Design a protein around this nucleic acid. Sequence first.
DNA 1: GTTTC
DNA 2: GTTTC
Lengths: 147, 147
Amino acid sequence: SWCLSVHQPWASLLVRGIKRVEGRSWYTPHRGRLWIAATAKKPSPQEVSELQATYRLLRGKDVEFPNDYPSGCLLGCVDLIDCLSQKQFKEQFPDISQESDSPFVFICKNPQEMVVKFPIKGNPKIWKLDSKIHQGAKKGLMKQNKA
Amino acid sequence: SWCLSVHQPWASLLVRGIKRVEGRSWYTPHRGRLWIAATAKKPSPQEVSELQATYRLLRGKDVEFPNDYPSGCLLGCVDLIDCLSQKQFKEQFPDISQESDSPFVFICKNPQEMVVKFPIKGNPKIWKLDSKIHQGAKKGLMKQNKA
DNA sequence: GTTTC
DNA sequence: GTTTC
């Protein structure tokens, strides 16, 4: 029931698990499940090319990118396990330390991506999902998980 | 008197010192001064964008790229101090290990860039500069160095 | 490699 | 944040 808005193409790289950390200028005390909504801003083909070229370097030529980078859309969720300073980030994750130069690095784990994505309007920083949106999206994910 | 042809935009990134290593599928025993010629293949604006975006990640937002990426051109030279396997590369250069995934990584140091660049036709692998080309280009660099 | 395509 | 511009 807490969500972070992110520009595409970064947003969909997060729920895919290709992008493993998210840099910001502010610290969050939030820990645990964090939904990811794409902002309304439409990514350009140049920005897609630039990001895909960057992650082909970081993850290798085999990386499979999202087919599409939808905007203004609830995409899925990550688990926010830590919010490190850049210093702690270079120390604790030395093999991916080049992946974020930001003052604070959001450590993302266990991503899940919604097959059916809901249109949504975001807010600054980390913001509250409506209970109905939350139950709906989480119900959709259970249909993706073994029951 | 030994030269390596490299596609742009990687070629100019090498003599600028922005790109610090050069990956290949083959090992060279060569050590020391290695000239860099851009191949004839003209780089597309998308490739420039993709590479510049990648190196803004690796070197930060302050990196200043070559104004132009001339093709089929003797650009300058690096010092080839070692030719590491990917294994040794990750061990010896853990702070930049993500910058090349190639089987062999050419460790480049002390780059120099010709202000006046000479048109040139390349050859495979590491090839011999003609003595007159070599003396011309090295004479141009001395004009760039303190005497 | 460059040039042709 | 979205929307306007």
